[PDB]
Amino acid sequence: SQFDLTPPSPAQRDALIAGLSDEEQRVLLHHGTEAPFCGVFLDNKLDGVYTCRLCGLPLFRSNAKFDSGTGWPSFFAPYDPAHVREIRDTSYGMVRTEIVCARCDSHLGHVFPDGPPPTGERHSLNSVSLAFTEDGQPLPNPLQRAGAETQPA
């Protein structure tokens, strides 16, 4: 990865958390799920990068976005394999794989093996877990880190 994946320290973490909605906290920090069909990014024409709403880490490119019919924004591949981490989720007596932001450990959604080609993979996202940066615009980079994060998306 061209990005510094070092977790923010408790101070940087709380600084960013403080800027977060009630609802954003519910999803990102407490494993919550958006009401399906309601998220701002469910339909989004634009070319660019979907970043972690907490720490700004690029998570998904628009060129990997597709319509799954589930009511959540969906991607067949992450920005970079190392940017999205998989965690076992046994909640609701189901067996699922939660996806978290590899840097800040925030909740994003789940990944499923029922996606389309090329990958056969479906990353199912909460729109509220994401911020969007259009192609060529500067990334939010709230942790002010070097490398690709100072570059336009």
From the list 5-13, 56-64, 124-132, 136-144, the region that binds ligand RSM by CB under 6 A is: 124-132
Residue from 51, 126, 133, 141 touching ligand RSM (CB under 6 A): that is 126
Rounded Cα distance between 49 and 61, Å, is 5
Residue showing tokens 């093996």: 113
Residue 33 is a binding residue for ligand RSM (CB under 6 A): yes
Largest Cα–Cα separation, the chain: 43
The distance of closest approach from Cβ of residue 61 to ligand RSM in the complex, given in angstroms and rounded to an integer, is 18
The distance of closest approach from Cβ of residue 6 to ligand RSM in the complex, given in angstroms and rounded to an integer, is 26
When the beta carbons of 12 and 25 are compared against ligand RSM, the nearer one is 25
When the beta carbons of 53 and 110 are compared against ligand RSM, the nearer one is 110
At 61, phi and psi to the nearest 5? -90, 150
Query: How many other C-beta atoms can be found within 10 angstroms of the C-beta atom of residue 26?
Result: 17
When the beta carbons of 13 and 110 are compared against ligand RSM, the nearer one is 110
- Taking the C-alpha atoms of 148, 75, 130 and 45 in order, what is their torsion angle to the nearest 10 degrees? 90
Rounded Cα distance between 153 and 134, Å, is 7
The distance of closest approach from Cβ of residue 16 to ligand RSM in the complex, given in angstroms and rounded to an integer, is 22
The distance of closest approach from Cβ of residue 60 to Zn ion in the complex, given in angstroms and rounded to an integer, is 12
Contact predicate 120/33, CB 8 Å: no
Query: What kind and span of H or E run contains 13?
Result: helix 10-17
Residue 79 is a binding residue for ligand RSM (CB under 6 A): no
Residue 115 is a binding residue for ligand RSM (CB under 6 A): no
Residue 110 is a binding residue for ligand RSM (CB under 6 A): yes
